[PDB]
Structure formats: structure tokens, C-alpha cells
């Protein structure tokens, strides 16, 4: 689409591959999403349960380690971090199952 | 003796402001592996009330982009279960504002090294 990559929202009409590229093993590639989530984006039935872990803009810049890398491909704002699950949430076990369904799911794609 | 009165939201959903600053919401800036390193004294104190916040927030990802672009993992450790993330967001080097964006981001990256 015409938006900067980081502001795109994937849906059935403009899916994860279209917005964010194929899943893969490279540092530059995303690794998250089974075939259903890839094709459906935010239309995926359990999208809200995934999105609850995504950071607000304030938390993205507040929690992460932020860097800047200048490479031949361009200038990149790098980010890394970790978000703790609330194991006192009764939904904790469902959250673990859901994340396990999508993290590196492309390793099973035919 | 207390938790901050604005701390009810999960950490990743918090919004820092003058009333709930970056240190209060997200911890002291520092060098350690999962510790935040971003913000000068003005941004730390003001959070999203910082007058140039929109020019920083233009680089933050939507929830869909966060899960679509990043490398996501999960780790179970003695402290709990953690969703790990890494990624990179490309700046538009053809934007006339590009040089100013770089200056603004660099002003905040590791700024904590220069003050107590």
C-alpha cells in the first residue's frame, strides 16, 4: 500500500504477505503467523488475543532497546525487547497455545 | 509503599505522560538487554506530552505491523513467560525531513548515558 510499512494493517483484502513480505528465517523477515493468520490479518478470529501483546507507540519507545543502523540498503531504526505474559491471567494457557500456533509456523508450510 | 495510580494497564499498553512518566511506566533507562534505552530528560519526563512526540511516533508500528514484521519468540524462564521481539523499521531517505528525523532519534537513543 501507500503507507509506510510500519503503519500498515493486514486484512483479508491486503494480507500479511502483501503488507509485510513472506515469512522466513532471515533477520529482515517476519516469522510470525500460520497460513490462516497470514491470509486474514486482523480479520483472523483470534486477532484480538494476539494484538493484546502489541505495544502502544509510547511502550514501543519506552520498553525497547532502540538503535540506528546505516547500511547500503538504507537507514534503519532497530528495536528489540521482551514483553512478560501475565501468568495470573486465567487466559494464560490459551495465550501460550495461540502464540505457539503462530511463532515460526512457516516451518511447517508445504 | 505504592504502585503508581496510572499503572493498571499491562506494561505494553501504557501511555507515558507528564502524570505517568517514562521511568514510572517503563523503568529507568539503561544498558541492559531488555531494559529501555530511549529518551532524553525532556522525553522521559513528558512521554507522549513531549512536543515532538508525533515525529517519534511516526516510526512506531501498528499491532499488525508489529506481528507482521518482527521476529517473535517466546521464552519460559524463572521470572515468567516472555514474548521476545526484534526488528527494524526503514526510514525514508528521500523524505526532505530525513536528516532531521535521524537527528531526533539519535538525540534520544542512549541519551541516559549523559545524566544521572
Swiss-Prot record, chain A:
ADP-ribosylated. The ADP-ribosylation is retained in the virion during infection. A motif (Nuclear localization signal) lies at residues 2-10. Residues 4-107 are annotated as: Dimerization. It is found in: Virion; Host cytoplasm; Secreted; Host extracellular space. Residues 6-86 are annotated as: Putative NLRP3 binding. Residues 1-110 form the CoV N CTD domain. Packages the positive strand viral genome RNA into a helical ribonucleocapsid (RNP) and plays a fundamental role during virion assembly through its interactions with the viral genome and membrane protein M. Plays an important role in enhancing the efficiency of subgenomic viral RNA transcription as well as viral replication. Attenuates the stress granules formation by reducing host G3BP1 access to host mRNAs under stress conditions. Homodimer, homotetramer, homooligomer with RNA. Both monomeric and oligomeric forms interact with RNA. Interacts with protein M. Interacts with protein E. Interacts with NSP3; this interaction serves to tether the genome to the newly translated replicase-transcriptase complex at a very early stage of infection. Interacts with host NLRP3 and ABHD8; these interactions disrupt the association between NLRP3 and ABHD8, increasing NLRP3 stability, ultimately leading to increased inflammasome activation. Belongs to the betacoronavirus nucleocapsid protein family. This is Nucleoprotein. It comes from Severe acute respiratory syndrome coronavirus 2 (2019-nCoV). The lineage of its organism: Viruses, Riboviria, Orthornavirae, Pisuviricota, Pisoniviricetes.
Amino acid at each position: 500500500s501507500k503507507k509506510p510499512r510500519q503503519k500498515r494493517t493486514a486484512t483479508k483484502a491486503y494480507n500479511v504477505t502483501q503488507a509485510f513480505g513472506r515469512r522466513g528465517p532471515e533477520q529482515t523477515q517476519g516469522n510470525f503467523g500460520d497460513q490462516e493468520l497470514i491470509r486474514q490479518g486482523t480479520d483472523y478470529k483470534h486477532w484480538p488475543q494476539i494484538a493484546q501483546f502489541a505495544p502502544s507507540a509510547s511502550a514501543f519507545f519506552g520498553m525497547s532497546r532502540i538503535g540506528m543502523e546505516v547500511t547500503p540498503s538504507g537507514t534503519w531504526l532497530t528495536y528489540t525487547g521482551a514483553i512478560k505474559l501475565d501468568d495470573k491471567d486465567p487466559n494464560f494457557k490459551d495465550q501460550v497455545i495461540l502464540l505457539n500456533k503462530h511463532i515460526d509456523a512457516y516451518k511447517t508450510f508445504p
